[PDB]
């Protein structure tokens, strides 16, 4: 054939990949502490002899969007929201250290703090709270525990949440949705990120997802139009080859 | 066997028919959840390579093998499915629909081109027999 | 299941579940000692197609 069909076909398939990314972002429009994935087409030119006429296209996800989302006021002392450019630290699935923005902190029957089922990492390893005690979280992450039955004079600090500062260019979303330091950024900032004393959290507010609707809509419209365009070419090439095959006759 | 160009073009026709069959099978089973063994349907692909064993560089086309794609299978969340894993995820085929449609059309076009080649070669061989009346 | 009709179906189902939770909260306003429900969502495993 004329491999021009293999260019428009790639452009049509990567458009479906982009649509699958955008639809995934739209599905998580209500996920607490969600970071939308950025999608971008990139052109790769095929190198070789003769007129460099073929340039294929391949989707690309250049990190995520770090713009803070909405802050819903839920009058719950455990739901916290982070200052912009801030991250909470939890223990990842494989016993590693991961970063998140979901402040929906839950207390188990044994007293351990968890986020989405992952243990919360305190100044010194996971945080264990006295069993069945009221928890208040300060602006700088200090945790006060009140034991029921005892007077409010008993309120004393227990542990401090680890709050780190990381930009978009330094973190990469792992396969389980937890952000981790990129290789270059890890090599310069060390393996574990030191807690920043300047980070401020807000108790009683939960951060929503930063999925922008207007950009999503525009992206879907553009993707549909591009797919239809590539499909026109895929039809042009087909007919042209169908007719060109006649020269092989007589 | 098939003389020369006859063998070459017949090999090409058979190979392109196999490729189109693979594409049609992939298109049909793009939404299959399971197979007889309980494993997800993995997209199949043919392997084209030349067959010029008796000291030649060009000899036509033959399909060495049919191979299943290694592109990550699509995970869908479904905890009630008997085939779901520990996390509740079910594996679904990695078929590229647009890719298989383009494969169907391209296979048809090159199959037709080889048909035109074989027909022309027959014509020429038919005229040859009338060399000098 | 073209990987874009499944992803959006999942979002539609999630929004329907959230609406069911909201309707349950609103219907049980007059009950005694009722604690309101809140729906929490999490994204599933992201698939990596090609490494950076």
């Amino acid at each position: 054939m004329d491999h021009a069909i293999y260019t428009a076909m790639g452009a049509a398939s990567q458009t479906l990949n982009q649509q699958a990314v955008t639809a995934s972002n739209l599905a998580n429009a209500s996920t607490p502490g969600f970071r939308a994935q950025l999608n971008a087409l990139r052109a790769v030119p095929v190198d070789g002899l003769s007129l460099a006429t073929r340039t294929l296209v391949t989707a690309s996800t250049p990190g995520a969007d770090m713009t803070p989302g909405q802050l819903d006021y839920t009058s719950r002392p455990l739901d916290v929201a982070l200052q912009q450019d801030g991250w909470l630290v939890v223990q990842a699935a494989d016993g590693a250290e991961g970063y998140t923005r979901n402040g929906n902190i839950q207390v188990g029957p044994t007293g351990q703090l968890t986020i989405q089922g992952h243990p919360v990492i305190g100044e010194g390893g996971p945080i264990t709270v006295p069993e069945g005690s009221e928890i208040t979280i300060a602006a700088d992450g200090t945790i006060s525990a009140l034991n029921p039955g005892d007077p409010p004079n008993t309120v004393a600090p227990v542990g401090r949440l680890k709050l780190v500062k990381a930009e978009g260019n330094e973190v990469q979303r792992s396969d389980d949705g937890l952000f981790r330091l990129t290789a270059e950024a890890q090599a310069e900032r060390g393996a574990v990120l030191a807690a920043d004393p300047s980070i401020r959290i807000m108790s009683g507010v939960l951060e929503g997802s930063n999925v922008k609707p207007v950009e999503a809509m525009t992206d879907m419209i553009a993707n549909a139009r591009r797919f239809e365009m590539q499909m026109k070419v895929i039809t042009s090439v087909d007919e042209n080859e169908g007719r060109a095959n006649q020269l092989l006759s007589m | 066997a098939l003389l020369n160009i006859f063998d070459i073009a017949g090999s090409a026709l058979a190979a392109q028919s196999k490729r189109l069959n693979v594409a049609a099978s992939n298109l049909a089973n793009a939404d299959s959840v399971t197979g007889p063994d309980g494993q997800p349907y993995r997209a199949k692909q043919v392997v084209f390579q030349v067959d010029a064993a008796p000291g030649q560089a060009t000899g036509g086309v033959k399909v060495a093998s049919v191979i299943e794609s290694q592109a990550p299978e699509k995970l869908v969340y479904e905890p009630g499915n008997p085939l779901a894993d520990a996390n509740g995820y079910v594996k679904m085929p990695n078929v590229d629909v647009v890719g298989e449609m383009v494969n169907t059309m391209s296979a048809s076009r090159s199959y037709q081109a080889n048909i035109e080649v074989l027909n022309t070669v027959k014509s020429m061989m038919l005229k040859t027999l009338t060399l000098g009346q | 299941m073209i990987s874009s009709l499944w992803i959006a179906k999942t979002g539609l189902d999630a929004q329907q579940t959230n609406m069911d939770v909201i309707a349950n909260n609103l219907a049980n306003v007059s009950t005694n000692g009722f604690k309101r429900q809140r729906a929490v969502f999490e994204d599933l495993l992201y698939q990596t197609i090609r490494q950076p």
């Binding site: 790639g10 | 692909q45 043919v46 392997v47 084209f48 030349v50 191979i67 592109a71 890719g99 383009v102 | -």
Partner: peptide
């Protein structure tokens, strides 16, 4: 000498 003739060889891939 050859490979998959179609979609799986005409798409960009990371190197090995």
């Amino acid at each position: 000498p050859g490979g998959v003739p179609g979609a799986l060889s005409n798409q960009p891939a990371p190197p090995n």
